[PDB]
Design a protein around this nucleic acid. Sequence first.
DNA 1: GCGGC
DNA 2: CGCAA
Lengths: 286, 287
Amino acid sequence: QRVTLTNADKVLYPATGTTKSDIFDYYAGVAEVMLGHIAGRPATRKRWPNGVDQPAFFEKQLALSAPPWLSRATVAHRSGTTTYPIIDSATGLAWIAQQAALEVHVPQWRFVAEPGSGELNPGPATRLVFDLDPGEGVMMAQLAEVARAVRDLLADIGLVTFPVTSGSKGLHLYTPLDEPVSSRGATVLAKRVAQRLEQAMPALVTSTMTKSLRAGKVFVDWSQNSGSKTTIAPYSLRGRTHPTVAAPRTWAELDDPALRQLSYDEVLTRIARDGDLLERLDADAP
Amino acid sequence: EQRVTLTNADKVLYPATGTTKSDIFDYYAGVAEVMLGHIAGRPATRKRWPNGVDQPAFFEKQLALSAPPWLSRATVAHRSGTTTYPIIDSATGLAWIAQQAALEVHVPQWRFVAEPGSGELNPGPATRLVFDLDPGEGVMMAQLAEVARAVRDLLADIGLVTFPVTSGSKGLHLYTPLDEPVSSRGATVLAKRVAQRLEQAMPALVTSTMTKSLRAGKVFVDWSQNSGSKTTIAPYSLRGRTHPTVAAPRTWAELDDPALRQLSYDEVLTRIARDGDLLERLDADAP
DNA sequence: GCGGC
DNA sequence: CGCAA
Ligand SMILES: O=c1ccn([C@@H]2O[C@H](COP(=O)(O)OP(=O)(O)OP(=O)(O)O)[C@@H](O)[C@H]2O)c(=O)[nH]1
Ligand SMILES: O=c1ccn([C@@H]2O[C@H](COP(=O)(O)OP(=O)(O)OP(=O)(O)O)[C@@H](O)[C@H]2O)c(=O)[nH]1
Ligand SMILES: [Mn+2]
Ligand SMILES: [Mn+2]
Ligand SMILES: [Mn+2]
Ligand SMILES: [Mn+2]
């Protein structure tokens, strides 16, 4: 399981001058905290081999040139069959870094070993994700107002909620399901939460997806629980002009009106101090 | 009903001549009927220039996961690892080669064969010898031909026919069909001996020995191209040089020309019309 | 040139 | 970024 880094000093984030070597070291540092939330899960990559300025691509299928030691499982979808890599070692993330795969994306479900035979099919969703996407001119004080409303709705079913800023524009809320439930079921539940909130605070929340997002409201993206969709993984970098991170936050932080996204270097600092704030999210692991 | 969509039609791949992807596509469409027989049943190695002859290139042997399911494919087992190659055997296969910016197509001297009992394909014997003539420092294309002629006779003196093909590069290729096919090992044995009998017959102009440098004033007869693991630029293939030259089959009379030169895709097209396939007898069979 | 349902 | 030996 050697991974040779190449183009160490190649700048991928021109704005901040972030070389592949930083990124390699970043993913080396976040490894212990990150791995648990992507283990057992099919890794979708979004790659910027030529920096965040040159075009990028999504990649699901594991290339034929990908190192044999990587874990892999197949998903069967209407037309075609996709074999994804499963990242579950620090070396796996090393590969991800070398690959210039800034972003790692996962669904909310894990592969499970077939009782009799052995090899893996997609299993039930282990967690819900609430994908909060702010509208035009949507105040931060209010984005959290909503996140808190979601938390209080879920705790009224004995479910805990963890906020993670996306590294992008909005906010993600994860909820562990002690007893896993199929993605359709996950979708059903998320959808009911969204709709119950939309009703409880009409002026700030919408459950309905719109081709151009709605001004002044927060859109609760419940269909992110569809077993066929992925959400940016916790502790992943983003391919934005600045190397921000999908970063877990404490609830206390959400009370900050001047709340903002975090950079890879800052997250690193926090981990040292904090540990994995999402520790109880995926307390079982491949 | 295998389709190939051309993308980036007007994208110039040879800046010097302004030859766009669409020219190349059309070329391969045009050379298809004559080219296909010499590469059918053979593992296609591609050398690709997706950004013109000025941007870097790569060899590709393995058939990518992303390539169209309708391509033919067989597998070769080697040292460590296994390689599934594409087999080009229809104009559409060539279409794919063009869309792929795979200027060059390289093949070995052998074909896959259907397994007598089971069906699927393992490497078979070599169907033809190839003599790869590599001229040295200050070697006049004239004397390069005398050597080519000397090879023809040594071979005719065993009832074997010889077809010349200019590589589209610097030197010259000779193919000989083997009526009865023979393992590449044996093909190498045969070629090595022709080369050596030649080296002796004309000491001043030929060498059989591979030098790291290329020896001035002499023509090196590359016999080891008959090795089963090696490939030679396929006849009718484009080259990825500053100019869009081609591995062109030439008639013997042409080799007598001292001002004998390489040919461009356009010329090969006008030749093929008037000529048919000069190599028609080289591979009389296969898809 | 291609890499996502 | 990787694509042959
Ligand atoms: O075009 C898309 C859009 C979305 N997605 C998947 O859906 C997830 C959520 O899609 P979002 O559009 O909400 O983006 P985001 O949450 O990552 O960041 P912000 O909205 O805060 O700006 C993304 O993280 C990605 O995994 C795609 O794969 N492709
Ligand atoms: O580095 C190499 C060299 C050669 N080869 C393969 O073996 C053959 C060796 O052939 P040559 O190296 O002699 O080049 P050529 O005959 O194509 O062109 P000239 O000599 O006329 O300039 C080539 O046609 C190619 O298929 C490689 O695959 N890689
Ligand atoms: Mn979002
Ligand atoms: Mn969304
Ligand atoms: Mn040569
Ligand atoms: Mn040679």
